[PDB]
Each structure stands twice: as C-alpha cells, then as structure tokens.
Amino acid sequence: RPKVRDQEGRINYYWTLLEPGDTIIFEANGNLIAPWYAFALSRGFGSGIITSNA
Amino acid sequence: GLFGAIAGFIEGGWTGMVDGWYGYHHQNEQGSGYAADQKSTQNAINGITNKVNSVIEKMNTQFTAVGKEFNKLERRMENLNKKVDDGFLDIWTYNAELLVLLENERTLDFHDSNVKNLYEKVKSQLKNNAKEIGNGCFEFYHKCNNECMESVKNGTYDYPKYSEESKLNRE
Numbered sequence: 001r002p003k004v005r006d007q008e009g010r011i012n013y014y015w016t017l018l019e020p021g022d023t024i025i026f027e028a029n030g031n032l033i034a035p036w037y038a039f040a041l042s043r044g045f046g047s048g049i050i051t052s053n054a
Numbered sequence: 055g056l057f058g059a060i061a062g063f064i065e066g067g068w069t070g071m072v073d074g075w076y077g078y079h080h081q082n083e084q085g086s087g088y089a090a091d092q093k094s095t096q097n098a099i100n101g102i103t104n105k106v107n108s109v110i111e112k113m114n115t116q117f118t119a120v121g122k123e124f125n126k127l128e129r130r131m132e133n134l135n136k137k138v139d140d141g142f143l144d145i146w147t148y149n150a151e152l153l154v155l156l157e158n159e160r161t162l163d164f165h166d167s168n169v170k171n172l173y174e175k176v177k178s179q180l181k182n183n184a185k186e187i188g189n190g191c192f193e194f195y196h197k198c199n200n201e202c203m204e205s206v207k208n209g210t211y212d213y214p215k216y217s218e219e220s221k222l223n224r225e
Binding site for chain 1 (some may be wrong): 116118119120
C-alpha cells in the first residue's frame with residue numbers, strides 16, 4: 001500500500017455496543033488488536049458535536 | 055393607514071405629550087397643556103403587547119440540531135440532509151419576514167383608527183357647541199373651563215347646558 005505515516009500495512013478498527021447482560025466473545029489465531037479498555041456508556045439529551053476554534 | 059388620522063387630519067404628533075400614546079391638548083382662560091387618554095392608550099398597549107407576544111410565544115424553541123458527518127460514498131444522503139435544512143430555512147425566512155411586514159402594516163392601521171375614534175368621540179359629545187377646524191381640533195362656541203375640558207375628555211359633556219351660549223356666539 002502507499003505509505004501513510006510511514007506504514008505500508010493497516011489496522012482496521014471495529015466497534016460494537018454490548019447490551020447489558022450480554023457476552024462478547026473474541027476468537028483468533030492471529031492479527032488481533034485486542035480491546036484493553038472499554039466504555040460503559042450513559043446517555044443524556046440535548047448534546048451534540050460542534051466544530052470550533054472558539 | 056386607511057383611516058386617515060396619522061399625518062392626515064392630525065398634522066403630526068405631539069412631542070410635548072409624554073404620558074401616553076393618544077390624548078388631548080387644550081387651551082382655555084385657566085391654562086393649557088397636554089394630557090394622555092389613559093383608557094385609549096392602555097387598551098392600545100394591551101392589544102399590541104398581546105400581538106407581539108403571540109408572534110414570539112407561539113414559536114417553539116430551536117432544539118439541538120447539528121449537521122451530520124457523511125463519508126465519501128454517502129453524497130446522496132449528504133445532499134438530502136442539506137436539502138432538508140435549506141428547505142426549512144427558506145420556509146422560515148420567507149414566513150418570518152412576510153409576517154412581520156404584514157403585521158407592521160396592521161399595527162399602524164390599528165393606531166390610525168384608535169386616534170380617529172377618539173376624535174369622533176369628542177365630535178359626538180360637542181355637537182353644535184364647537185366647530186371642526188383642521189389639525190383635529192374643536193373650537194368651542196362657549197367658555198369651556200377646566201371642569202368642562204375634563205367633562206368632554208371623560209365623555210360626560212352636558213351638551214344642552216351650553217347651547218344657549220353657543221347659539222348666541224355662533225351669530
């Protein structure tokens with residue numbers, strides 16, 4: 001691949017939201033970048049993302 | 055406006071009147087000056103205040119809404135998102151500007167009628183005891199002291215009481 005940030009390989013990133021009480025299973029025989037940290041989310045209302053230099 | 059009072063039968067307003075919107079000016083042997091018609095002014099204020107607040111209060115709060123990111127293969131959806139925002143902006147801009155213009159015209163007619171109606175109220179009180187002159191004034195044919203001026207303003211003028219004097223002064 002063309003170099004990006006001096007690399008020729010790539011790491012693709014994936015995600016999922018695990019519902020309360022469920023189980024996530026990871027099986028692999030190579031090429032895994034394992035989760036180390038994960039986030040327990042709490043949702044609210046009225047928030048959003050803005051782009052600003054203020 | 056369509057009633058013809060503002061800069062019509064009334065040459066222009068009074069910078070010397072400070073206690074209201076509509077009112078009277080008088081002159082007699084005991085003095086002169088300006089005084090507002092508090093009943094007419096307050097009703098005009100309440101009407102307008104309700105109108106302004108209706109335009110504002112009936113509007114809903116703009117709730118959080120931001121744009122959305124789309125990737126390079128989602129241009130059709132990005133363009134739909136934009137179409138929705140542009141369409142809503144065009145509708146609200148057109149309506150906001152046109153509403154204000156239509157209501158400003160009506161407010162000025164509202165005021166034009168209110169002062170004209172005040173003029174007619176006095177004309178009906180005075181009948182033949184005064185004559186109409188320009189600038190929205192009634193020139194009395196009898197002596198009208200301060201008690202008389204208050205009586206005319208309050209709509210309690212005792213017309214026949216002054217009729218003998220005016221008949222003589224009218225020649």
